[PDB]
Write a protein that binds this ligand. Structure first.
Ligand SMILES: [Ca+2]
Ligand SMILES: [Ca+2]
Length: 274
């Protein structure tokens, strides 16, 4: 049997899938710890590794496989169900099995995705610090028409401090915060002027190695909901620019409160894809 994780109806991705738009012919790169390509509920059609000695189609951490399943777990009678289950899914390994990687490897992965015609980049990753090379890579991807999505960070809030991580903080990247199954902001969700939209991030059930399923918490679970939503929109409206996809997501989001804490609110992909 197949389970529908709560995030799929919460963002109204089920409604868009029922219209017949499921991400077909949209290319999404998951820049992470790899993807377990042999998982029965995923179809990884290509990728690249920039982690020395690690293949992109294996995932010794689990994070990348989980993120990938939120985007793209196959619609069948097995496992779970992704936001955009017909996407062309690419594993871009930029983090090792311990979840860390050089920033130049992350840049190489962004560049690979751009050169190879990805429509959407998901970076469920980041840190407190950026770099000129990282900013240039995401800026170039967006300028060349890629929708770039990243986790806002899991640093929470403290007074008025801006805790958005990089690359989410760059203007070319959609910074995604996290809500739970009640649609309440998760306390770990980072905050600040760059926070753009919210998506399900607490208690997110997805694919996990080896051939299994697991529940994780983080803004890095919220980001792939937005990446998948972008792919749903593009599968219905293939001629849109990256900015047009991005604005559909933020202009139709459900208001949750002040943008510092919630951005424009919870994405509603049914409304965004109208
Ligand atoms: Ca499935
Ligand atoms: Ca980030």
């Amino acid at each position: 049997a197949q389970t529908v994780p709560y995030g799929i109806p919460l963002i109204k991705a089920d409604k868009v899938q029922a219209q017949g738009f499921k991400g077909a012919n949209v290319k999404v790169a998951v820049l992470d710890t790899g993807i377990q390509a042999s998982h029965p509920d995923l179809n990884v059609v290509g990728g690249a590794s920039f982690v020395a000695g690690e293949a992109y189609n294996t995932d010794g951490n689990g994070h990348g496989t989980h993120v990938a399943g939120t985007v793209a777990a196959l619609d069948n009678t097995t496992g779970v169900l992704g936001v955009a289950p017909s996407v062309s899914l690419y594993a871009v390994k930029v983090l090792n099995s311990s979840g860390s990687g050089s920033y130049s490897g992350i840049v190489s992965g962004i560049e690979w995705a751009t050169t190879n015609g990805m429509d959407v980049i998901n970076m469920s990753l980041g840190g407190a610090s950026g770099s000129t090379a990282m900013k240039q890579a995401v800026d170039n991807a967006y300028a060349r028409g890629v929708v770039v999505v990243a986790a806002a960070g899991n640093s929470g809030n403290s007074g008025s401090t801006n805790t958005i991580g990089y690359p989410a903080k760059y203007d070319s990247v959609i910074a995604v915060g996290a809500v739970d199954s009640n649609s309440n902001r998760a306390s770990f969700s980072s905050v600040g002027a760059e926070l753009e939209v919210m998506a399900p991030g607490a208690g997110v059930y997805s694919t996990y190695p080896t051939n299994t399923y697991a529940t994780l918490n983080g803004t890095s679970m919220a980001s792939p909901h937005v990446a998948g939503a972008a792919a749903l929109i593009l599968s219905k409206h293939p001629n849109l620019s990256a900015s047009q996809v991005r604005n559909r997501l933020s202009s139709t989001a459900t208001y949750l409160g002040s943008s510092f804490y919630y951005g424009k609110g919870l994405i509603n992909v049914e409304a965004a894809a109208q």
